[PDB]
Swiss-Prot record:
Free-text function comment from the UniProt entry: Regulatory subunit of lactose synthase, changes the substrate specificity of galactosyltransferase in the mammary gland making glucose a good acceptor substrate for this enzyme. This enables LS to synthesize lactose, the major carbohydrate component of milk. In other tissues, galactosyltransferase transfers galactose onto the N-acetylglucosamine of the oligosaccharide chains in glycoproteins.
Protein name per Swiss-Prot or TrEMBL: Alpha-lactalbumin
Tissue: Mammary gland specific. Secreted in milk.
Location in the cell: Secreted
Coiled coil start-end: none
Family to which this protein belongs: Belongs to the glycosyl hydrolase 22 family.
Complexes and interactors: Lactose synthase (LS) is a heterodimer of a catalytic component, beta1,4-galactosyltransferase (beta4Gal-T1) and a regulatory component, alpha-lactalbumin (LA).
Source organism (scientific name): Homo sapiens (Human)
Length: 11
């Protein structure tokens, strides 16, 4: 992950 935190699948 690493980035996910500031990205997340969101929508």
């Amino acid at each position: 992950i690493d980035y996910w935190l500031a990205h997340k699948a969101l929508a």
